[PDB]
Amino acid sequence: LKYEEIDCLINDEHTIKGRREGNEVFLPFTWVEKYFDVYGKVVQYDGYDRFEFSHSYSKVYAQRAPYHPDGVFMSFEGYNVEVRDRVKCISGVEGVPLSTQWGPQGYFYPIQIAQYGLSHYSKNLTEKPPHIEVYETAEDRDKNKPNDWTVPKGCFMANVADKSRFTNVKQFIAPETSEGVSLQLGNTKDFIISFDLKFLTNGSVSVVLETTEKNQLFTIHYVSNAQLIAFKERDIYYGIGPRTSWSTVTRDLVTDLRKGVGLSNTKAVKPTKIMPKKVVRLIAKGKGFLDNITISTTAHMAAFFAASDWLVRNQDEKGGWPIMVTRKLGEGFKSLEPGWYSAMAQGQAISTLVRAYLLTKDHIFLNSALRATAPYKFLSEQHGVKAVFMNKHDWYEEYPTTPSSFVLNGFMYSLIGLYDLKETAGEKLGKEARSLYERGMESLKAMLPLYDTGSGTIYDLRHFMLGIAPNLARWDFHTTHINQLQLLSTIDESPVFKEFVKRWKSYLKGSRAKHN
């Protein structure tokens, strides 16, 4: 019985080269992979090779506990927003990501900002507490080389009381055409730098980094202007704004280095493998005050509050976060001009704001969340987010298009937001959220089957709205769909959610609905 080449005719159209042993035919995975759109590779173990086949990529989140508004946000403990190449950088002034997804010019995308917040919130609950190293308090610390300041000629420093802040602070005076005053740091493990800052004049706070790229030094300059980001090797510049009143500056030096070096005029940051291996020293220029200089493994809550604060300050009078970029969802849909709202933005923002409220009891956050339900009440053409499927089912549009698009995953995020709010706001204040949630959940249960292909899910209902082919959801949207339904199945006991979760999971392993 010979093992030999055999011609394999595919659908009477093309011949590939297979192999035959007796009656058994073997087909090349090169063909299988492309023809069925599946995944595989040879994995090398110690003394053992194994081919490993997968129907899909992407994994379902292993939910540990029922969903609650003050817990982790779905699967976002595993999200890494800032490494996404559509994140140009973390704004120095705002402390939140700028997106370039639909425009190289860059814009604050509320969805991305909410996800930044919610992922950092979730990581705060799941990760080990950070190591925190304190380099300067200007107190009676009063050892451990906290006074390793270099003060060149023409510069001055002092420990001085700040009555307003009930603490001692480090005063510094250093002209910009000088070396500046310099604090030796030397951290090789942790790369989140933090310091309380108040400038009297223009100036900068700079951090020198040893990197993994051939031992070479890069400096990151945090400058008292509004310029976003600049890179002229080996110097990276972020404007952090005037900082003429006390604030805590928190920066991730890994992200700030990678986004600097990777700076691009395109919609995508250049890939780089560069990492900082040592935080060498901090340089202060101009006239001002410093306190509480620290380096931490992580600073999740600072990120979360930067997102929350941004959402409060940037909400408009209609309760919305307008998206200031043109969105063309596809042929047959009208272009959305800048200033459109997204049900996904509203929902993700509400989930952020509700968590901010529950932590602080600061009603400013809750009130912003309550205002954010207003766009759910108005049709897309009335500058809202509401669509109605076949004059029967209310829907909250990720993309408020004409005709309506009915994107599934944005809708479910819009509902989770409403849930967080209605559970938190109390009976009287939460009435509108409760009503929108109940109507929305009724729609979801009725319409879920329209998104099921029998071997996957559809992203939206454009096939029906425009009379074209289904827009099939790629596997990472399919797992998003599962993660969302899995979450909803813990706050609503409807059997339909559990049955759909189970079937949609089976699709990841190549199961199919039965044919007749």
Ligand X SMILES: O=C(O)[C@H]1O[C@@H](O[C@H]2[C@H](O)[C@@H](NS(=O)(=O)O)[C@@H](O[C@H]3[C@H](O)[C@@H](O)[C@H](O[C@H]4[C@H](O)[C@@H](NS(=O)(=O)O)[C@@H](O[C@H]5[C@H](O)[C@@H](O)[C@H](O[C@H]6[C@H](O)[C@@H](NS(=O)(=O)O)[C@@H](O[C@H]7[C@H](O)[C@@H](O)[C@H](O)O[C@@H]7C(=O)O)O[C@@H]6CO)O[C@@H]5C(=O)O)O[C@@H]4CO)O[C@@H]3C(=O)O)O[C@@H]2CO)[C@H](O)[C@@H](O)[C@@H]1O
Ligand Y SMILES: *[C@@H]1O[C@H](CO)[C@@H](O)[C@H](O)[C@H]1NC(C)=O
Ligand Z SMILES: *[C@@H]1O[C@H](CO)[C@@H](O[C@@H]2O[C@H](CO)[C@@H](O[C@@H]3O[C@H](CO[C@H]4O[C@H](CO)[C@@H](O)[C@H](O)[C@@H]4O)[C@@H](O)[C@H](O[C@H]4O[C@H](CO)[C@@H](O)[C@H](O)[C@@H]4O)[C@@H]3O)[C@H](O)[C@H]2NC(C)=O)[C@H](O)[C@H]1NC(C)=O
Ligand U SMILES: *[C@@H]1O[C@H](CO)[C@@H](O[C@@H]2O[C@H](CO)[C@@H](O[C@@H]3O[C@H](CO[C@H]4O[C@H](CO)[C@@H](O)[C@H](O)[C@@H]4O[C@@H]4O[C@H](CO)[C@@H](O)[C@H](O)[C@H]4NC(C)=O)[C@@H](O)[C@H](O)[C@@H]3O)[C@H](O)[C@H]2NC(C)=O)[C@H](O)[C@H]1NC(C)=O
Ligand V SMILES: *[C@@H]1O[C@H](CO)[C@@H](O[C@@H]2O[C@H](CO)[C@@H](O[C@@H]3O[C@H](CO[C@H]4O[C@H](CO)[C@@H](O)[C@H](O)[C@@H]4O)[C@@H](O)[C@H](O[C@H]4O[C@H](CO)[C@@H](O)[C@H](O)[C@@H]4O[C@@H]4O[C@H](CO)[C@@H](O)[C@H](O)[C@H]4NC(C)=O)[C@@H]3O)[C@H](O)[C@H]2NC(C)=O)[C@H](O)[C@H]1NC(C)=O
Ligand W SMILES: *[C@@H]1O[C@H](CO)[C@@H](O[C@@H]2O[C@H](CO)[C@@H](O)[C@H](O)[C@H]2NC(C)=O)[C@H](O)[C@H]1NC(C)=O
Burial class (CB in 10 A: 0-12, 13-18, 19+), 179: middle
Cβ 55 vs Cβ 506: under 8 Å: no
CB of 290 to ligand U, least distance (A): 11
111 is in the binding site of which of ligand W, ligand X, ligand Y, none (Cβ under 5 to 8 A by kind)?
Answer: ligand X
CA pair distance 379, 396, nearest whole angstrom: 9
Q: Which two tokens stand for residue 301?
A: 């809550």
129 is in the binding site of which of Ca ion, ligand Y, ligand U, none (Cβ under 5 to 8 A by kind)?
Answer: ligand U
Q: Does 82 bind ligand X (CB under 6 A)?
A: no
CB of 178 to ligand Z, least distance (A): 24
CA pair distance 226, 284, nearest whole angstrom: 18
Among 37, 127, 176, 442, binds ligand Y (CB under 6 A): 176
Partners of 231 in the β-ladder = 236
The residue ranges that bind ligand W (CB under 6 A) are 201-202, 242, 244
Length of the chain: 516
- For the chain, the straight-line distance linking the first and the last C-alpha, in angstroms and rounded, comes to 40
CA pair distance 334, 336, nearest whole angstrom: 6
Count interface residues toward ligand X (CB under 6 A): 29
CA pair distance 278, 482, nearest whole angstrom: 41
CB of 175 to ligand Y, least distance (A): 6
CB of 102 to ligand X, least distance (A): 6
| CA 17 to chain centroid | 45
Cβ 405 vs Cβ 399: under 8 Å: yes
Closer residue to ligand Y in complex, CB, 284/366: 284
300 is in the binding site of which of ligand U, ligand Y, ligand W, none (Cβ under 5 to 8 A by kind)?
Answer: ligand U
Name residues whose C-beta falls within 8 Å of residue 284's C-beta, 6 or more positions apart in sequence.
Answer: 172, 174, 180, 181, 182, 183, 203, 204, 205, 206, 290
Cβ 272 vs Cβ 175: under 8 Å: no
- Residue 227, phi then psi, degrees to nearest 5: -70, 135
CB of 220 to ligand X, least distance (A): 20
x-or-dash string of contact with ligand X, 335-374, rule CB under 6 A: ---------x------------------------------
Q: Which residue is nearest to ligand Y (CB)?
A: 176
141 is in the binding site of which of a copy of itself, ligand U, Ca ion, none (Cβ under 5 to 8 A by kind)?
Answer: ligand U
Among 274, 329, 491, 496, binds ligand X (CB under 6 A): 329
DSSP E strands in 359-475: the ranges are 386-389, 393-396
Give the residue carrying structure tokens 């600061």: 362
Cβ 94 vs Cβ 247: under 8 Å: no
Q: Does 202 bind ligand Y (CB under 6 A)?
A: yes
What single-letter amino acid sits at 327? R
Q: Which two tokens stand for residue 421?
A: 């709010």
458 is in the binding site of which of a copy of itself, ligand W, ligand Y, none (Cβ under 5 to 8 A by kind)?
Answer: a copy of itself
Residue 165's CB is within 10 A of a number of other CB atoms, namely: 14
Which segment (189-197, 199-207, 411-419, 456-464) binds ligand Y by CB under 6 A? 199-207
Among 137, 404, 424, 486, binds ligand V (CB under 6 A): 137
Q: Does 381 bind ligand Y (CB under 6 A)?
A: no
CB of 135 to ligand U, least distance (A): 9
What single-letter amino acid sits at 426? G
The residue ranges that bind ligand U (CB under 6 A) are 124, 127, 129-130, 132, 134, 137, 139, 141, 292, 294, 298, 300-301
Q: Which residue is nearest to ligand V (CB)?
A: 292
The residues in 54-93 that bind a copy of itself, with binding defined as CB under 8 A, are 54-55
Give the residue carrying structure tokens 């202007």: 225
Closer residue to ligand W in complex, CB, 202/490: 202
Which segment (43-51, 92-100, 283-291, 486-494) binds Ca ion by CB under 5 A? 283-291
Q: Angle at the Cα of 358 (from 443 to 481), degrees rounded to 5?
A: 30
Partners of 235 in the β-ladder = 219, 232
Q: Does 113 bind ligand Z (CB under 6 A)?
A: no
CA pair distance 87, 99, nearest whole angstrom: 5
Among 70, 210, 470, 505, binds a copy of itself (CB under 8 A): 470
Residue 235's CB is within 10 A of a number of other CB atoms, namely: 13
Q: Contact positions toward ligand Z, by CB under 6 A?
A: 162, 165-167, 169, 196, 246, 291-292
User: Applying CB under 6 A, which residues contact ligand X?
Assistant: 58-59, 61, 75, 78-81, 83-84, 86, 99, 101, 109, 111-112, 115, 329-330, 344, 398, 407, 409-410, 459, 471, 476, 480, 516
